[PDB]
């Protein structure tokens, strides 16, 4: 998991957020993200 040191919200944070993993959940229960489509 990548991390940017700087942050407008402050201290330090990993870049990925709740919305991305929500989209992953949606694509899994679709039954258009992939692992590669998160990599790009």
């Amino acid at each position: 998991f990548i991390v940017e040191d700087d942050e407008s919200l402050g201290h330090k944070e990993l870049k990925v957020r709740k919305g991305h993993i929500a989209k992953l959940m949606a694509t899994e229960y679709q039954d258009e993200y992939t692992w590669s489509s998160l990599l790009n």
Partner: peptide, 20 residues
């Protein structure tokens, strides 16, 4: 505390169905 001994998934799916 709740301490999370067990978890749920499709309920949170439906929560995001209402969130989106």
């Amino acid at each position: 505390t709740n301490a999370s001994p067990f978890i749920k998934r499709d309920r949170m799916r439906r929560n995001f169905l209402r969130m989106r």
